[PDB]
Nucleic acid binder design. Sequence first.
DNA 1: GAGCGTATGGCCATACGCT
DNA 2: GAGCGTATGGCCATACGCT
Lengths: 190, 191, 481, 481
Amino acid sequence: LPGKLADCSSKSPEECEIFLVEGDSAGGSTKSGRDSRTQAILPLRGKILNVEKARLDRILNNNEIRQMITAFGTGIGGDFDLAKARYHKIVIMTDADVDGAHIRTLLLTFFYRFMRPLIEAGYVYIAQPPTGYKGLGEMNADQLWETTMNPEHRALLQVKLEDAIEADQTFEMLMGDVVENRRQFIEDNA
Amino acid sequence: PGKLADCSSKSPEECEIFLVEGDSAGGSTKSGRDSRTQAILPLRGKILNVEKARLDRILNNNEIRQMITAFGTGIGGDFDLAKARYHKIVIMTDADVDGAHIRTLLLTFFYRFMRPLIEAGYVYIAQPPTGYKGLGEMNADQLWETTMNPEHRALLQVKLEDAIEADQTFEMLMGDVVENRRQFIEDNAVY
Amino acid sequence: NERNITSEMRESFLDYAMSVIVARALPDVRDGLKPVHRRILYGLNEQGMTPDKSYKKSARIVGDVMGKYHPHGDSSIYEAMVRMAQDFSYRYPLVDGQGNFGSMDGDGAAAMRYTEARMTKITLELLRDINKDTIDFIDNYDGNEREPSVLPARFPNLLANGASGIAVGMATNIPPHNLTELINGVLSLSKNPDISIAELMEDIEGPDFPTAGLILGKSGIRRAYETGRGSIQMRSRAVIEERGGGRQRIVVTEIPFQVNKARMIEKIAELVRDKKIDGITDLRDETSLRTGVRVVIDVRKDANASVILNNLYKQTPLQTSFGVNMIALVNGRPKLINLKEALVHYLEHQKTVVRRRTQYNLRKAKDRAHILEGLRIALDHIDEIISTIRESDTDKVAMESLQQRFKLSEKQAQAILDMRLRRLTGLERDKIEAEYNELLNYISELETILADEEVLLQLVRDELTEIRDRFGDDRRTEIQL
Amino acid sequence: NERNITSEMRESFLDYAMSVIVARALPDVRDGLKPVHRRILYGLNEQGMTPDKSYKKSARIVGDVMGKYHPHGDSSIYEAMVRMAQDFSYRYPLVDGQGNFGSMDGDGAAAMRYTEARMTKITLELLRDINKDTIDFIDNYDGNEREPSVLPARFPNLLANGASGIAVGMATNIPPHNLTELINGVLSLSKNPDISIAELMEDIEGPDFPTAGLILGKSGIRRAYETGRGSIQMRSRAVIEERGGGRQRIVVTEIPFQVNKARMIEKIAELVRDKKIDGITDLRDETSLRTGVRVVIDVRKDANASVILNNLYKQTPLQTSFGVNMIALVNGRPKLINLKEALVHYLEHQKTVVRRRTQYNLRKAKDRAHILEGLRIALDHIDEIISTIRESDTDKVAMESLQQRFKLSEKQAQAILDMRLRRLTGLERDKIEAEYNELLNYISELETILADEEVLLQLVRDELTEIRDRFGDDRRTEIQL
DNA sequence: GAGCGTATGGCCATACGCT
DNA sequence: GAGCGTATGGCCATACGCT
Ligand SMILES: COc1c(N2C[C@@H]3CCCN[C@@H]3C2)c(F)cc2c(=O)c(C(=O)O)cn(C3CC3)c12
Ligand SMILES: COc1c(N2C[C@@H]3CCCN[C@@H]3C2)c(F)cc2c(=O)c(C(=O)O)cn(C3CC3)c12
Ligand SMILES: COc1c(N2C[C@@H]3CCCN[C@@H]3C2)c(F)cc2c(=O)c(C(=O)O)cn(C3CC3)c12
Ligand SMILES: [Mg+2]
Ligand SMILES: [Mg+2]
Ligand SMILES: [Mg+2]
Ligand SMILES: [Mg+2]
Ligand SMILES: [Mg+2]
Ligand SMILES: [Mg+2]
Ligand SMILES: [Mg+2]
């Protein structure tokens, strides 16, 4: 449990939730400012692999991706089982900065291409930490707890899929291999 | 890297090895050296006190192993001076109190495991500029011109004159008996 | 050139050993600080990183202290600063930290890029009067800066926060204490120089840990105070609660000082799995912030909890000894000091600080009064002064002419030449007279302090009592008789 | 509440992408800097870490820049600063480093605790006139500090030192250039706005790398200058020495820009091992401080060195292409710019910086001239001014009385009241008249600059030529026909 | 291809003395 | 048994675009 995960005491997935925090420093304080019985911290280190740019052999060889699959215990692709899930709430916790947004996009790319019925079942959530420039690491153990660790005070955004044919085009454009379509999107939307 | 950076020459009589204190110094040394006749072995952290340790620990210490592999002489009863890869083994530490400590620890290992290397006058001490800054805060140009260039450098040849006195000295300073060490400090006080 | 091996060993080892002793591992008896701590606090002070202002990034404090005073690793500075901000390490914390600064479970603080700090309100008392020639300043490692040899330390910090350092040939281990108890002991010593350690112990009952807990007997304490060396038995605060119909549970609320909570739990867990302790059904760390330390040991039915608890004290760090070895730098040299010696040396530092301050304050007061006398002569004869200046071709001639005509000093003439035209108004002329008169009264007040050693000693007492009333708190560790 | 997956992807990705583009990876067309570089240089400037003053510890520079302007990792700041001090990375280095700052072998710099830095004499030209309202300042990340949006950049830095950055949806790759060549091109553009890229190339021959070497043909350069995109073939300087007994060897003295020497040698060494190249007997790195880069490749007796060398250019990084992609921030938005556009935008920045400076200098001159008029009235009627002040009860009355009697302004009256008695000496009164008269000529001189766009343009030219004569150097890279 | 350059830091071993 | 606290930082993987 030093750089790896710290799990929830409850064996029931309806009661328990997993928080994918951003950075080492965020992982430590979130492991301290949690409800050990219901809350499980998986600290993610560095930028997570863009699955839309990578081939399967590389995706499965990644230890960041492998840690998540082992934590949810759902399986990937065609062997994904919504019922065989360890948690009912998968919370993306990231810095309130531009790189925090980036990590959030990379995680959703993996979940959309490999664990699609997890998002459809409304299991995927986005934690809402205070915006003001500081970021997760700079926060104290008790500030971290009353900010987003109490599902009382906390405000989570339920990730929902409304148009799968539009989402497919969106992930392939933003996270794909073709720069020109990405460059166009930036040029147009600024 | 952090590993040994050998010299192009295969004749040990003209080949020199600089045991450099720290990674950052080791890089500049490797850049400022004479590639033909000068090898650099960067020594990271405080060297294991062999006087306080047992053999299983000494042989398991990587920094000790790196030195043995570099000299290729062997240790204890199997030390062969004829098998020495360098006729000059230069201790190059910072001009500070911790540089002095590392220098003592290295001499303790050499005295207890490679004694005929010191006797043959192969062990030397580099004399870098004592201007409060250490080795890692020095340029590659000046590290050569002051501590490595044979034309201007000043090396201190380590000599053995009284083996009975030296044995008592290493035992007191580096031994497990604190009281004798504390006494040495309280007597030699100010200096 | 040549060099003897014995000479090189003796010379080089002594250099390191003496430096570790006088400039690394051991604290000064006067301010209770190791060089790294003093450099962090002075660095905070110079940068104006006081309690009234915002938290400043740890990497900025570390980089400043390193570049200006501490020629060592950034980690060794950051780590020393971190400990000073920990309410479980420092009895009266010297650093005010924001972010992950570590916990009792042994986990470290976040990297310096994620943390922020500033000084605590008590640290201002360590730095109080530093810029009033109270302490001696020295040149830094490179010679481009100045740094304090010792801080004024207006509260007994060595005994307050304690010390723990591993040198060469020696080591130190001073426990923390209660500020109210210490200051009272200092006041009792100033009034009675021949005070016994026994008499002092009526004020200073023993160590007071930030981690609270319990001390077993006054025996261990007495030896440590008389000789400087002694073993003090520290025990966790544990209660046996009557939960179930027959069921019972042990609750640990306070653990010994410097004991790692997670390690202690691991040691208990290890005995249970190895069957070296029978009776424990479950063990859990219920510790939270509002909850504090809460280690729950639930006892199996028909098994005596009193038996299990006493065996836990013996076999785990739930009970741990504190090996007191009071070594501090006294006159720049290491010394094993007893309780009275620690207090005597501290009181002498305070006597010097306060005298030196009063002497400084007086020089400045006498200097200002002199200038005011000059300005008073100037204002009383402005028509002439103006005439004298106007008739002068250069500043040099005006300076000489003013000095020669109005019997003024070089300083008085220069002050008059630097005098702005707005000082010639009605009210501005009256302000100068009011300042001079108040100043003469302050000079007399100061001169009275330096004239009587008892008045000066009473001032030290008065200022020490002020700190005691402001920062002194309740005793945390319970010493069991 | 809820959140659409497509909306979060589109919104979050665009936020990151735009930030990487306008505030990370791409340089500004005007000063040629990415935010990190600008923050390092401004931090050096604010801390007075100038060439005349001693080297300051890297950890202090990094910690300051981080805490005040760059809310990111200390390593990312230190590494950016390191590059700026490398004579093989920067064509005109912007940082003056002391200690291990790395080498061509891919050898990194020492940790920031070792090493120290200050700005180079050329960097003073990037910061020249910054405090004369020449550039716009903005609030920092936390709002407790102010920072420059762009530096005045009195030399064309974007083309001089080049740029290399990987953004999102785009990237930039601008090669370094010769300062004498660039400034000459800038001067030729100011005189002829309809100058062709062909005509500009009579001054700007092509890229000039700090690593020197050779460029193969003007074709690659021409395309990169006309479109902002092109491939430039960089080749190592290698000579074949004819030796005794037919035998030959190749000596590499200069290697391509951004090419790792050790990696290049490793690539040659692996081809020999793998038998992918035939004819090499021995390979050596004879590089020393005395000689510079010296990579010697020994050739077999029955082999042709000209054949081996040409195969080495093809199969190893002994010959490497430079993929020019001139993307810079023009009006806070990314743009693929050609050579002329880079120069036009730079010339406009200089026109604005010089105008803004002259406008600032004028405001201050007019302000001072006004005060001097007041002091001149004061000195001419000093006996009256003194009585007026003396008769006044408060500063407020003195202020009103002076303005009402001597027809002075609030500022003129306040300046007279702040006037020291030493300004009434012979020489000090004469200085005031001399200052006023010199100031009136300076006001006319400045007003003439703002009145005629050609005088202003000529001033820009004059100042640019001064920099060219002081810092301009010989061309390092040889462009072969 | 793989690596250019700004972005998202814990792990490891040693000296030293005491108990 | 082992660990207290000041001392002596390179390695590793990922995004991103071009060639
Ligand atoms: C490379 O040396 C160190 C090691 N190494 C020692 C061993 C020897 C060979 C390589 N591997 C291991 C790890 C380590 F474990 C930790 C630290 C350390 O914490 C530290 C600091 O400033 O805090 C500084 N240094 C350097 C100044 C010595 C450390
Ligand atoms: C009772 O003290 C010792 C203990 N521990 C007992 C305590 C329990 C909790 C954590 N540690 C402390 C220390 C220990 F672990 C090791 C040693 C030890 O190796 C040693 C030696 O001569 O090498 C000497 N003694 C002293 C008896 C001379 C040790
Ligand atoms: C722990 O994350 C990092 C890795 N790790 C990524 C992998 C994932 C799991 C653990 N092992 C590897 C190594 C790495 F290789 C390098 C850096 C790095 O250079 C850096 C910096 O400020 O310079 C900061 N970070 C942290 C801010 C992210 C790095
Ligand atoms: Mg962040
Ligand atoms: Mg050093
Ligand atoms: Mg460390
Ligand atoms: Mg016990
Ligand atoms: Mg890094
Ligand atoms: Mg090639
Ligand atoms: Mg033992």
